């Protein structure tokens, strides 16, 4: 079951279905045309027409509208959230609140302006802890901005000014410092709008089983429309011809609406059964298509990584010692709100169990990450604790005038080739060491990736982060061939390439970066540890942090492909038997001697065809309980499994139509509605 | 007479299986493109002289070549029938046919349908029959066996880009496959009594004093292709009941063998070229069960016969007002089922005078699509379309990707097979419906009651299923009837043929996949049952009311 508020809003969306969009589903739209014609002839009877029976056609029209409403209800339950939503991107574009300047200077005349205020040629400052309004170039100053949308890495990047690093795309959170940005890119067609262009334009392709089922529906509908249409001139040779309203009832009763209801009953049962593996599935077509996947695209930071970057080891030089840089690192991560700093504290207790360095009792003069020097740390009265990246280290060495530690340089580029981001500390002259901040692998995903290799899924890791650490993480996780330093457009191109190759593609991620990848993915899984945009996009949201939920997703997809084949067996047999069950009712009216063809001795052809309408309204309802709690789930070979399926569900698809028509006509006869 | 039908069916089936195997191996050599023994050099000289040479062509070139040859033959036959006055060999100066009948015959003798609406003794001349109509039967049979050769080559070719050569294939078909068998059965027709001369119409003075005029013409030269290529339109108004046409029940047996010889030879050729005879025996068992059960019921209904004749003083109530006496009633029913199954319009007996059930079951095999022991080339690709139908019905029943003969099948093949399967029920329903709207077609009634509508449905189904058989007595000389049947025959056969080349081209470009877990085994009694259930139930789905409002109504009333 699903919550009442979401099913009520979804039923409002169902009632929103107009004929402008009703022709997406052909069998249900043909039922809709038949309903319109029988409602029109019913109100013509109310206004006065040639025949005399009106309530029978009124009941046909009412039950046909119930059938249409329930079919559209199940259809919206299956794929009302399949479309990728860009509400988070729209909100972060519309929050605006830019700080406009009329003179380029740190202070000057700045006011709050919306996003539409920006144009060709503008000056806007972003200070500290705000959002960049639009794409542009840096005029002056230095800023540490978090490249969240680009490269998917939470580690901050310094931009500065007067160099090659003056391009701020907008939508990226500034961490500290301040910046003045010239608006060179117009409102519209910016970086976020180029993202939202195919975040909104997802258009996931239809699964081959669904296309083949739709083609079978078209074929059977052409057959039944052909028969009911040629019934009219073929009865002109009889004494009395068939009526137009009962011909419309035959047209809306014969067509395989059971399989059309099944087309979404499978998805509804899929969203119901996905809660067993603790995954919020917004659309059941991806759950169905999970059994025919062949590749798995994956993002490093967030999905394979735990998130924040952890600390591996303190690497000192030969002239210093483990304690002699561990104390400096602990001082450098005292007043550090960063989870990396918390990891430094954890490793400090892991090595030395160091104490009595209180955050406020010790006079910790905190220097933040400087814009122009890129150095940060803690100063005490007799010791100046600072740390930073290697270029800032070399700048500080040049400012001091001392000899440079090239041994530290080869240590840090060795660990960078290993795949760690260096963080060098400055105390104890220039001969103190570095913290190896490297990416970290989650709880034993290598065995699950080997299981994926055995199953046949090709795992390709694409993240847009640094190539060296990306290759290191791929090697540590057992990933196959991979891509690195890729744009979101490159992820889109890879998704389109894997879709054009023919195989279904599954993409799992957490960040805003791969939102187009999740939008264009066939079976897309979001991550609960990620941002809101990834959860809004895609078809699946993982409730846990486990990246290898796709094993259970593929298992339930194969099981539900098997049960979908079983239900297709039952539905095809049901429609074939229903044709024979309600076909003699077209002959008793136009020919008296064919009532012996009626077999069951139905009370009247009108009662039989009204019972067919009731069976139409009831079978699509009963499919969902039949979709739930399947009988056959263990795999067999093709011929024996088809034999067992055909037996156990052809008996059902033969017995259910005859029994249903007979029971409903008996109920109608004892109710006296005829 | 109960066991006599069983012995007749058993004898016919055994002699068919005996005669099919060498022709099956030869036809399999024709798929394999290896030259027949003794014809290696002469065919090379002929191809060099004609200019066809060797040029591998794709499905589009094949399709436009076949339809260009068919359209050119159609234009040639239309002009030849129009200019009947100027042509030689006219012992009686017969008038040239009207434009409507000329168009009807021109589109009829092309595209294998070979429907007849005239009487050739008073309408058709010698030279049209001798030259135009015989070569049109030849070209129709060659085109059908070439299109099925292309489909078989598309199935057996892996990762290629061509199908063969159109005119090379047609030459190798009609110079060494149809012509020698035509000699060997035409000389037998002459031995048992037929006409292969050019004498004028001869006066006959009877003992009663009422003189008559004997029909005249080269009968056996048209017989040997009308039976072999399953065309079904003869010199005479009786397609196979005239004494000069079909003399003896022994020749009736030879005619039955010639009608079923080519399709089962194609099936054996397909089985031999697939590498496993299990597929060939599977299709032949699937057609043989329908053939046996449908010669049954028909035989029982015809030996039950007229209920009025028993009470009217006749000793035997056997249905005999539509048949002859040299051949009885059981062989009449057998030939009726054969000719309604094989898309051959040759009637041994007047189908209009049959019992209701024993006329509806041959009409049932008429309506279904001529797929059970079917046309000269039409029936095999009809069976291939329906087995592809059964393959993806099994695939969607099994929940996995459907492949046939190790080759994957996708959505383009899906749509094209659906169109090719459903094009003929659409035509046989809509054309018949249009005929019952118009008062002109309703003016062509012969039997009042549901039998007139049954006659109309039979005529439209014969048009759009490419058969040629008819409940006789229909006044099909009307321009409306002629044009409607002409359009039905044209769009029916060509809108079946074009998707066949679409399937062939889409299967050439693919490759034979290996064994898989989801691959359905394409042989066995289970697959026979699935295929027969598929074709019989789709035919039921689109033909229950049309049969119920006609012959079933006549039987119940």
């Amino acid at each position: 079951f699903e919550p009442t508020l979401v099913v009520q809003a979804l039923k409002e969306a169902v009632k929103k279905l107009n004929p402008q969009a009703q022709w997406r589903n052909p069998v249900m739209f043909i039922v809709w045309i038949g309903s319109l014609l029988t409602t029109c002839i019913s109100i013509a009877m109310a206004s006065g027409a040639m025949p005399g029976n009106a309530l029978f056609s009124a009941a046909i029209s009412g039950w046909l509208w119930i059938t249409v409403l329930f079919a559209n209800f199940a259809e919206a339950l299956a794929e009302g959230r399949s479309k990728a939503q860009a509400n988070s991107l729209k909100g972060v574009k519309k929050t605006a609140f830019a700080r406009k300047l009329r003179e380029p200077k740190y202070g000057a005349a700045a006011d709050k302006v919306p996003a539409d205020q920006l144009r060709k040629g503008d000056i806007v400052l972003v200070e500290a802890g705000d959002i960049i309004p639009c794409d542009g170039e840096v005029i002056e100053g230095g800023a540490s901005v978090d490249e969240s949308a680009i490269t998917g890495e939470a580690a901050p990047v310094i931009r500065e000014s007067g160099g090659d690093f003056a391009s701020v795309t907008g939508g990226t959170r500034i961490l500290s410092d301040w910046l003045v940005i010239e608006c060179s890119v117009n409102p519209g067609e910016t970086f976020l709008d180029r993202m939202i262009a195919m975040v909104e334009g997802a258009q996931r392709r239809k699964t081959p089983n669904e296309i083949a089922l739709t083609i079978l529906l078209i074929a059977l509908t052409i057959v039944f429309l052909l028969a009911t249409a040629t019934l009219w001139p073929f009865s002109a040779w009889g004494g009395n011809a068939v009526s137009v309203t009962v011909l419309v009832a035959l047209l809306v009763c014969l067509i395989p609406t059971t399989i059309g209801g099944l087309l979404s009953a499978i998805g509804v049962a899929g969203m119901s059964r996905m809660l067993g593996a603790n995954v919020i599935a917004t659309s059941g077509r991806a759950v169905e298509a999970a059994g025919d996947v062949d590749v798995l695209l994956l993002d490093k930071t967030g999905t394979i990584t735990l998130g924040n970057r952890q600390a591996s080891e303190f690497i000192p030089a030969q002239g210093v010692d483990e304690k002699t840089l561990a104390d400096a690192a602990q001082l450098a991560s005292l007043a550090d709100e960063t989870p990396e700093g918390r990891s430094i504290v954890i490793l400090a207790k892991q090595r030395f169990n160091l104490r009595e360095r209180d955050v406020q009792s010790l006079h910790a003069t905190f220097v933040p990450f400087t814009a122009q020097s890129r150095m940060s740390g803690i100063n005490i009265d007799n010791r100046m604790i600072r740390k930073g990246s290697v270029d800032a280290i070399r700048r500080h060495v040049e400012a001091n005038g001392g000899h440079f530690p090239t041994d530290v340089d080869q240590k840090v580029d060795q660990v960078a080739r290993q795949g760690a981001t260096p963080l060098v500390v400055v105390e104890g002259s220039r001969v103190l060491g570095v913290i190896a901040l490297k990416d970290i692998v989650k709880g034993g995903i290598k065995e699950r990736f080997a299981q994926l290799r055995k199953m046949g899924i090709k795992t390709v890791m694409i993240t847009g982060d640094n190539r060296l650490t990306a290759a290191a993480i791929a090697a540590e996780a057992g990933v196959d061939d991979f891509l690195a330093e890729a744009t979101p457009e490159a992820k889109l191109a890879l998704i389109r390439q894997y879709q054009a190759e023919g195989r279904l593609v599954a993409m799992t991620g957490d960040g805003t970066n791969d939102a187009p990848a999740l939008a264009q993915a066939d079976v897309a899984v979001a991550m609960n540890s990620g941002t809101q945009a990834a959860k809004e996009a895609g078809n699946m949201v993982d409730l846990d942090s486990n990246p290898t939920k796709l094993i259970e997703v593929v298992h339930i997809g194969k099981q539900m492909l098997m049960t979908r084949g079983s239900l297709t067996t039952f539905s095809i047999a049901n429609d074939v038997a229903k044709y024979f069950a309600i076909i003699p009712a077209a002959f008793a009216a136009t020919y008296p001697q064919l009532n012996a063809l009626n077999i069951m001795c139905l009370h009247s052809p009108d009662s039989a065809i009204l019972s067919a309408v009731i069976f139409n309204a009831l079978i699509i309802v009963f499919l969902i309980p039949l979709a739930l709690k399947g009988v056959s789930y263990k795999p067999l070979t093709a011929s024996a499994m088809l034999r067992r399926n055909l037996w156990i569900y052809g008996l059902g698809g033969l017995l259910v139509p005859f029994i249903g028509i007979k029971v409903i006509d008996l109920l109608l006869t004892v109710c006296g509605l005829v | 007479m109960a066991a006599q039908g069983f012995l007749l069916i058993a004898t016919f089936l055994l002699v068919l299986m005996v005669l099919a195997r060498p022709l099956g191996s030869g036809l399999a050599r024709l798929i394999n493109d290896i030259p027949l023994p003794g014809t290696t050099g002469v065919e090379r000289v002929l191809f060099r002289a004609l200019g066809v040479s060797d040029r591998e062509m794709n499905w589009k070139q094949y399709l436009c070549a076949i339809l260009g040859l068919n359209m050119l033959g159609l234009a040639v036959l239309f002009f030849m029938l129009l200019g009947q006055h100027y042509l030689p060999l006219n012992p009686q100066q017969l008038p040239g046919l009207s434009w409507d009948l000329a168009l009807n015959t021109a589109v009829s003798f092309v595209t294998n349908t070979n429907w007849q609406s005239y009487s050739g003794e008073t309408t058709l001349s010698y030279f049209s029959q001798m030259a135009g109509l015989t070569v049109q039967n030849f070209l129709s049979a060659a085109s059908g066996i070439a299109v099925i050769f292309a489909l078989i080559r598309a199935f057996t070719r892996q990762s290629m880009s061509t199908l063969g050569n159109a005119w090379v294939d047609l030459l190798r078909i009609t110079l060494w496959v149809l012509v020698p068998v035509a000699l060997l059965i035409a000389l037998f027709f002459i031995q048992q009594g037929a006409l292969q001369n050019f004498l004028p119409y001869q006066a006959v003075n009877t003992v009663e004093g009422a003189q008559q005029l004997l029909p005249m013409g080269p009968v056996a030269s048209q017989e040997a292709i009308k039976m072999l290529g399953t065309n079904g339109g003869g010199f005479f108004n009786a397609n196979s009941s005239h004494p000069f046409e079909n003399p003896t029940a022994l020749t009736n047996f030879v005619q039955m063998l010639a009608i079923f010889l080519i399709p089962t030879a194609l099936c054996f050729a397909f089985g031999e070229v697939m590498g496993d005879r299990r597929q060939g025996r599977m299709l032949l068992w699937a057609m043989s069960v329908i053939f046996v059960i449908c010669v049954g019921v028909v035989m029982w209904a015809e030996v039950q016969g007229n209920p009025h004749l028993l009470a009217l003083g006749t000793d035997s109530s056997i249905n005999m007002e539509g048949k002859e006496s040299r051949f009885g009633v059981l062989v009449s029913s057998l030939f009726a089922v054969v000719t309604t199954a094989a898309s051959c319009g040759a009637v041994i007996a007047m189908h209009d005078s049959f019992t209701a059930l024993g006329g509806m079951v041959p009409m049932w095999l008429m309506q279904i699509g001529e797929v059970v022991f079917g046309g000269v080339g039409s029936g095999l690709y009809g069976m291939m379309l329906f087995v592809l139908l059964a393959v993806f019905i099994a695939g969607l029943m099994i929940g996995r990707t459907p492949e046939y003969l190790g080759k994957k099948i996708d959505v383009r093949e899906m749509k094209l097979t659906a169109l090719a399967i459903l094009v003929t029920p659409t035509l046989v329903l809509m054309g018949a419906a249009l005929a019952m709207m118009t008062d002109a077609g309703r003016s062509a009634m012969l039997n009042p009651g549901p039998h007139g509508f049954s006659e109309v449905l039979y005529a439209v189904s014969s048009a759009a299923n490419n058969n040629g058989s008819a409940f006789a007595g229909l006044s099909a000389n009307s321009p409306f009837w002629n044009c409607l049947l002409a359009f039905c025959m044209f769009v029916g056969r060509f809108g079946v043929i074009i998707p066949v080349m679409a399937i062939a081209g889409s299967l050439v470009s693919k490759k034979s996949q290996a064994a898989s877990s989801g691959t359905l085994p394409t042989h066995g009694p289970l697959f026979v049952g699935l295929l027969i259930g598929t074709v019989l139930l789709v035919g039921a789905l689109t033909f229950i009311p049309a049969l119920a409002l006609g012959p079933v109504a006549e039987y119940l009333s």
Partner: peptide, 27 residues
């Protein structure tokens, strides 16, 4: 005179054309 017969024929023709359209293109 066809009071609704010709309208029914046109409706069947248009609906069959729409069905063939939906067969050709997977909606």
């Amino acid at each position: 005179m066809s009071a609704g017969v010709i309208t029914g024929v046109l409706l069947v023709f248009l609906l069959l054309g729409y069905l063939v359209y939906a067969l050709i293109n997977a909606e």
